[PDB]
From Swiss-Prot, chains A, B:
Protein purpose: Master transcription regulator which represses the degradation of pyrimidines (rutABCDEFG) and purines (gcl operon) for maintenance of metabolic balance between pyrimidines and purines. It also regulates the synthesis of pyrimidine nucleotides and arginine from glutamine (carAB) and the supply of glutamate (gadABWX).
PANTHER family the record matches: HTH-TYPE TRANSCRIPTIONAL REGULATOR RUTR
Quaternary data: Homodimer.
Protein name in the entry: HTH-type transcriptional regulator RutR
Length: 201, 201
C-alpha cells in the first residue's frame, strides 16, 4: 500500500543505482549509498538486508522499466506498430536513464555473477511467452520469417547501444540522445532498418 | 623477427587484457600484469611506457580487428554483398575475441576517458570516410534512404551484443556462439534483419 514507504524505497534504489553505476558492486559501500540517499545504514538494511539484495533490487527495477512494453504485447496487436513503440520506448529509456543501462551492462560484462539465475528464470519465461506470440505473427503472415529471439535481441542491442556506447556515438556524430534532433534521427533510423527488415513482402 | 621479444610482447598484451578486464584500468597495477606475464615491471615498461599506453594498446588491437572489413570498403563494391559479409566477419570476432570485446565495452561504460582521443581522431576520421561511401550507395539508389552512421552503429551493436551480453543470450537461448548451429542461426538472422531493412524498394 504505502506511498511514503515507496518514496523511501525508490530513494534508496535511485541512490544505489547511481553509486553502483560509478563504483561497481565490489567497489561500492552501503555506507555511501546511505549517505547519498539521506538515510542511515540501519534504515537501508531494514529495506535491503545485504548489498547483494540491494544490487539485485536495482537491476530488477531496470528490467521492469525495460520489459514493460514487451509484457504489454497481446496476440492481436498490430505487430509492426507495437514494435515501433517498443523501439521508441527503449530509446526514450536510453536517453533518460542511461546509468541504468550502463549498470545492467556492467553486470553482463562480469558474467552476470549475481543476476544470472534471474535471467534463466523470470526473463527466459517471459521471452518464451512472447517469442511464441511473435512466431504467431510470422505464422499468420503479419511479419516476414524471422526468429523471434534474435529480433528481440536486436531491439535490445540497437537501443541500448546509444546509452552504453554514448561516448563513441558522440565521438563520431557530435551528439547525444539529449539533442532532440538527434534523438529523432536515431528513432527514425533504428525503426526503419528493423521494421522494414521484418515487414511482410 | 626476434624470438623472445615477440613472445614477451604477446605475454604482456594477454596479461594486460585479462587483468584489465577483471580489475578495470584503475584497479589494475602494472606489477600485476608483469607478474602474470612472467616479466619484470621495468621490462614491461620498455614494451609499453605507461599503464595508459598498455591499455590503449590492448584496445587498439580489437579496434583493428573490428575495423579491418570496414577499411576494405570501396566505391565500386556491391553494397548489400559487402554489408552482408561485414556482419558475418563481425560476429566471427564476437565468437573468437569476446574478452577483448568486453573490455572495449567497459571502457565505453566508463565514459571512454582513456580512449577518447582515438575515437575523436582516427576512428571518426575513418567513419566519416566510409560514411561518405555508404552515403554514395544511398544517393545512387543502391541502398534505402538511411543514415550511414546509424547503420554502422546497428552493425556494431547487434554483432558485439552476442559477446558482451553472452550470459543473457545463453540464459534465454541455452546457446553461445561456440555452438555452430546457434552461430549460423545468429548470422542468418542479424543479416536478414539489417539487410532486408536497408534494401532499396
Ligand atoms: O530490454 C531489455 C531487457 C532485458 N535485457 C536487455 O538487455 N534489454
Ligand atoms: O566494430 C566496431 C568498430 C568500432 N567500434 C565498435 O564499437 N565496434
Amino acid at each position: 500500500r504505502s506511498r511514503a514507504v515507496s518514496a523511501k524505497k525508490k530513494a534508496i534504489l535511485s541512490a544505489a543505482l547511481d553509486t553502483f553505476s560509478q563504483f561497481g558492486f565490489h567497489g561500492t559501500r552501503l555506507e555511501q549509498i546511505a549517505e547519498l540517499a539521506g538515510v542511515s545504514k540501519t534504515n537501508l538494511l531494514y529495506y535491503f538486508p545485504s548489498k547483494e539484495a540491494l544490487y539485485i533490487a536495482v537491476l530488477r527495477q531496470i528490467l521492469d522499466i525495460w520489459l514493460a512494453p514487451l509484457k504489454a504485447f497481446r496476440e492481436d496487436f498490430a505487430p509492426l506498430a507495437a514494435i515501433k513503440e517498443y523501439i521508441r520506448l527503449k530509446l526514450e529509456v536510453s536517453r533518460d536513464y542511461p546509468q541504468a543501462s550502463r549498470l545492467f551492462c556492467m553486470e553482463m560484462l562480469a558474467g552476470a555473477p549475481l543476476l544470472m539465475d534471474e535471467l534463466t528464470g523470470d526473463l527466459k519465461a517471459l521471452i518464451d511467452e512472447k517469442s511464441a506470440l511473435i512466431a504467431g505473427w510470422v505464422k499468420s503472415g503479419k511479419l516476414a520469417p524471422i526468429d523471434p529471439q534474435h529480433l528481440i535481441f536486436m531491439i535490445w542491442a540497437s537501443t541500448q547501444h546509444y546509452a552504453d556506447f554514448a561516448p563513441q556515438v558522440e565521438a563520431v556524430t557530435g551528439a547525444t540522445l539529449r539533442d532532440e534532433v538527434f534523438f529523432n534521427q536515431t528513432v527514425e533510423n533504428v525503426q526503419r532498418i528493423i521494421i522494414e527488415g521484418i515487414r511482410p513482402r
